[PDB]
Ligand binder design. Structure first.
Ligand SMILES: CC(C)=CCC/C(C)=C/CSP(=O)(O)OP(=O)(O)O
Ligand SMILES: [Mg+2]
Length: 294
């Protein structure tokens, strides 16, 4: 009769489990982000850990809006970014996002919105995140490609029908854009497309594809090399095929015990694919929150 709302406690429970698993202190602006999460409707929450050798960076949480209210979802997400940026010790520079959104932006061409954080004990190295997926939008695909410095060799990876765009805003004023072209299982398993992958990507980067239903590549001037994203169909497959170190294994062993998706994402570098032990890896786990009449 009325629109349903998922209780904030259910969403914050999932985030709270992650905070407790990895000893996350209330870094700024985690409390503001939890209030933001409380105000949302149906969503998917993604928690992740970034492993660098024996160092775990676990204060990484993204929210994906499940409904299609893209204009209003972007604007509540940006309102979070700007409120967090109000504190005098923080400097956020949203110029690259202002450039992307400039003019008469067509919000009917948006497909997904995500808002998130990656917080560090060193306030300056902390960042806020915004993701916008657009489809069939030539003008704004071109803007994003220009902001991302897409050269040939990289342009071949980008699709025309859809483009997942990420914005990173560091709390010291630095900012970066990232493009994430993706292929679905049905596409990368087709011999035409695989043979084009064989030219731009080593066999090592193609190795996990049988385990996945989605494959993506992160392209950003901020990256040392392209970042490979694998959406594993079965979280239980991970430790059989990837030789991760003890620090990453602690993250994964905890998430093997959690309620949530049966799938997971792993992100790695191609060089870290031609090597014995994986010591630089991001692991992403999620849980969906859906109600009866959202
Ligand atoms: C060393 C390289 C290029 C990749 C290995 C480690 C890695 C997966 C890095 C990107 S970390 P970040 O940009 O914070 O993660 P996203 O939100 O973009 O997924
Ligand atoms: Mg990135």
């Amino acid at each position: 009769v009325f629109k349903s709302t998922i209780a904030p406690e259910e969403k914050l429970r999932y985030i709270g489990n992650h905070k407790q698993a990895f000893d996350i202190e209330p870094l700024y602006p985690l409390a503001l982000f939890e209030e933001f999460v409380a105000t949302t409707g149906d969503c998917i929450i993604e928690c992740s850990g970034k492993i660098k050798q024996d160092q775990l960076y676990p204060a990484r949480i993204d929210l994906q809006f499940s409904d299609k209210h893209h204009f209003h979802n972007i604007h509540t997400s940006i309102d979070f970014l700007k409120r967090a940026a109000s504190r005098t010790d923080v400097n956020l520079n949203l110029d690259i996002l202002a450039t992307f959104l400039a003019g008469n932006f067509d919000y009917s061409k948006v497909q997904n919105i995500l808002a998130g954080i990656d917080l560090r004990q060193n306030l300056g190295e902390s960042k806020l995140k915004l993701f916008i997926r657009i489809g069939d939008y030539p003008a704004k695909m071109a803007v994003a490609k220009h902001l991302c410095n897409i050269t040939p060799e990289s342009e071949a990876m980008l699709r025309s029908d859809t483009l997942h765009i990420g914005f990173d805003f560091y709390l010291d004023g630095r900012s970066a854009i990232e493009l994430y072209p993706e292929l679905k299982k049905d596409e990368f398993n087709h011999p035409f497309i695989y043979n084009q992958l064989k030219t731009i990507l080593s066999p090592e980067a193609l190795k996990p594809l049988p385990l996945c239903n989605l494959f993506g590549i992160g392209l950003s001037p901020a990256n040392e090399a392209n970042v490979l994203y694998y959406h594993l169909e079965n979280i239980e497959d991970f430790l059989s095929y990837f030789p991760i170190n003890d620090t990453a294994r602690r993250v994964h062993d905890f998430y093997l015990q959690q309620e949530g998706s049966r799938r997971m994402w792993v992100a790695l570098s191609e060089s870290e694919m031609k090597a014995g032990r994986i010591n630089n890896v991001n692991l992403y786990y999620s849980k969906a929150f859906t109600s009866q009449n959202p």
